[PDB]
Amino acid sequence: SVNLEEACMERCFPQTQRRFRYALFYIGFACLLWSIYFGVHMKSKLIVMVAPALCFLVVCVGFFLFTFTKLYARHYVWTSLVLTLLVFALTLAAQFQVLTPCLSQVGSFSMCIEVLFLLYTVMHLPLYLSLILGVAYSVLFETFGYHHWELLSRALLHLCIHAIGIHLFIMSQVRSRSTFLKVGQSIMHGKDLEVEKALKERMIHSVMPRIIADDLMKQGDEESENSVKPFKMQQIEEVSILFADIVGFTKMSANKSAHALVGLLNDLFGRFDRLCEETKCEKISTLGDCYYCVAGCPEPRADHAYCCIEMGLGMIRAIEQFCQEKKEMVNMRVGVHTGTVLCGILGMRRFKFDVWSNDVNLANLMEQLGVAGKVHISEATAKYLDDRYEMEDGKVTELKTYLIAGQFASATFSSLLDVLLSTTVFLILSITCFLRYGAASTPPPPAALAVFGAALLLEILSLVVSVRMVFFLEDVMTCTKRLLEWIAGWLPRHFIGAILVSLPALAVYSHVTSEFETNIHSTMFTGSAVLTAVVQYCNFCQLSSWMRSSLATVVGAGPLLLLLYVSASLIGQEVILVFFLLLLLVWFLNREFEVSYRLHYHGDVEADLHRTKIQSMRDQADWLLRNIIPYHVAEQLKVSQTYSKNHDSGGVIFASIVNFSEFYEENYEGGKECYRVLNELIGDFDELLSKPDYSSIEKIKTIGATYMAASGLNATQCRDGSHPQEHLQILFEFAKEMMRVVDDFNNNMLWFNFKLRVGFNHGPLTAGVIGTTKLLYDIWGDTVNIASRMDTTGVECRIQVSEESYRVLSKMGYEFDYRGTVNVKGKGQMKTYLYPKCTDSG
């Protein structure tokens, strides 16, 4: 991730800067304490040492204040480079003048070590370059110390110090990269999440008015949103139910492109939405040739009739400007009635907040008998119309009828590696201490080999724990580990790992069981041992911080204060002070590192949280879309802006509850108990669509007792084992199905049985989507209004199937009783067929 690993450092500068600075602080105190030794007791016979230390001090403080410089951005890698080169020079220069017998070589060694761990941590050197220059410094240091096996010992000291430092580098920078990538993912998750939220909100307000949508967006009732994974209805009265149905409708819909026609339609509909929003008139929808609105139902309005009729005149202006614009001989009849309407939301598929009354049906009948240019109004309209407009008693030419016309890197991963490393290095520790015996083929002390093997097996058992945990080999028994990990918790793991990391102290002490203080070679050698030992405790940064630190502290401390009284006098003082320094050093280092680990944990949590949140949000939005849109069109707009297509043969069935409005009887608060029961049976019909064979059944929409279905539409590819016109058969299957369903629901309908009439047709039709920044998608064609009047002229318990639909369904196993010949507007007296073969009388 080249430019991305670049961005890492782009943001990951300040931590490196501050760590560098505190390391500088360390170095300063280091040369400080060297000087205070060499000035207090010994080496006061030559002051050529304090001057190098002090010029080191001054160049380090120059680093200190220069770090803040503006020209420090890309000016840091080679900075670390030159600085550590400097430090190396100081070390070896102080180192050479030795091998006289007055002072320990390990002091220089100790420096070399802590130096190189600093070089490790903050310098952020190239993996290979870091390693190689480090090991180079190591080897040149051990060589220049030369002025049969002790040298090999010091060498292994180098090697272990390498291994620890190098792993520390690798884990630190993988921590960096991982945390960087993770926080990036988190913020991108936040952003595309709120994007998803905005999108689903667009979908909400496109399927719910601002009043009710904004009501549900504070989730007053959480059961609504639980269903989204709870309906309130209001008998809002004194509202203006307004309709407008296209005249010249079937005409203008004769020979268009079947797509651009929809386009100009949607254009006019944007005009009409403008009219709604300007007149504060709450539009409802469009049923084929007929657009419709109410006027301020949720926000109750009194001049609702006024803005109603003024928006009507506005739409009149719109249609005139368009028909004179697109050169069309088209208009639309208009019809409005006012009064009471109970409004609410039922249904779980393609459903909506809608409205119900006979005032609705009154405006409906008046509109179908209405004329373009003069809205057909009733008395309830004219009663507070106040006739400030072009009132006209427009009588029906065939009921108070009027007209108006104007005016990687996991937690175990880490423990895996660090355990492995602790093990191997404690083993090379063991090699080192052992090889004290070079000629003594027999080892006198038994504790050495004893606890050697002991710690060895402890390491190997922790090893196999880790390796069969990760690799999942499961030789003996796996449920064992399952019950076993339950005991390894945040603190138990703490103490066990504490033992594991603390052991090398007693490991080297097994050799301390032997007499040493006589042999100062042995003495200083053991000092080298114990310091090279304490170096490691910075390792398991997944473990304790405060307790880990204190542990390393006391374990380094104790035995040396013991040797203080076990006696080569003031060299104890100097070594204990250097231990003090390196103590506070590693203290704050692994402090920083465990802190980085803490923040990694933290950010990990919240990032996965955001992932889950946007997952849920996206999924809920998609669920809502599937409520509101089909799939093929989801693909169409997923790739385009719109879609429309003349589908020349599909079925269409309409179902209307005959005895609804009477057992609707309004003794109650609108009888909305009955409306609860209606949402019950509606959800039952949704279950009906929830059938797999009823996946290809396109339930279009509904208006209270209305129900609209059509198929042969998403049937875009017909396979050989499928007939292109079978969908009518499964549609009629669904018809008899829902008949059975209402029959069963009636048995549970308390002291009542609801009945419905149904009318069917099939043939020509055309799909097209409307809403952009809105959402409306509908089908049209003569088939629509044909089945409309069919169900309109129907009778319950009998299935009025049109002539040609009767024919095409009879050959598919359905037996129809010839109802008769009924007038169809646009078709005149049309031959009709009920399905049930005298299930009723006949």
Author numbering: 97 to 197, 217 to 262, 278 to 359, 384 to 552, 566 to 574, 780 to 939, 976 to 1250
What does the paper say about this structure?
Adenylyl cyclase 9 (AC9) is a membrane-bound enzyme that converts ATP into cAMP. The enzyme is weakly activated by forskolin, fully activated by the G protein Gαs subunit and is autoinhibited by the AC9 C-terminus. Each membrane AC contains two conserved cytosolic catalytic domains and twelve predicted transmembrane (TM) helices, with cytosolic N- and C-termini of varied lengths and regulatory roles. Here, we present the cryo-EM structures of AC9 in several distinct states: (i) AC9 bound to a nucleotide inhibitor MANT-GTP, (ii) bound to an artificial activator (DARPin C4) and MANT-GTP, (iii) bound to DARPin C4 and a nucleotide analogue ATPαS, (iv) bound to Gαs and MANT-GTP.
To characterize the conformation of AC9 in the absence of G protein α subunit, we determined the structure of bovine AC9 in complex with MANT-GTP (an inhibitor we used to stabilize AC9), referred to as AC9–M throughout the text below, using cryo-EM and single-particle analysis at 4.9 Å resolution. Our choice of MANT-GTP as a ligand for the active site of AC9 was based on two considerations: (i) we have used it successfully in our previous studies of membrane ACs, (ii) the overall conformation of the AC catalytic domains stabilized by MANT-GTP is similar to that stabilized by ATP analogs, such as ATPαS, based on X-ray crystallographic studies. Due to the low molecular weight and innate flexibility and pseudo-two-fold symmetry of the full-length AC9, the resolution of the AC9–M reconstruction could not be improved beyond 4.9 Å. Although the cryo-EM maps of AC9–M and AC9–C4–M featured the density elements corresponding to a bound MANT-GTP molecule, the location of the nucleotide density in each of the maps was distinct from that observed in the previously determined AC91250–Gαs structure in the presence of MANT-GTP and forskolin (AC91250–Gαs–MF). The nucleotide density stretched out towards the forskolin binding site, suggesting that the molecule may have been captured in a previously undescribed orientation within the active site. The local resolution of this region in both density maps (AC9–M and AC9–C4–M) was not sufficiently high to unambiguously define the pose of MANT-GTP. Based on the available structures, the G protein-free state (nucleotide-bound state, corresponding to AC9–M) can transition to a partially active state upon Gαs binding (Gαs-bound state); subsequent binding of forskolin (Fsk) fully activates AC9 (Gαs/Fsk-bound state).
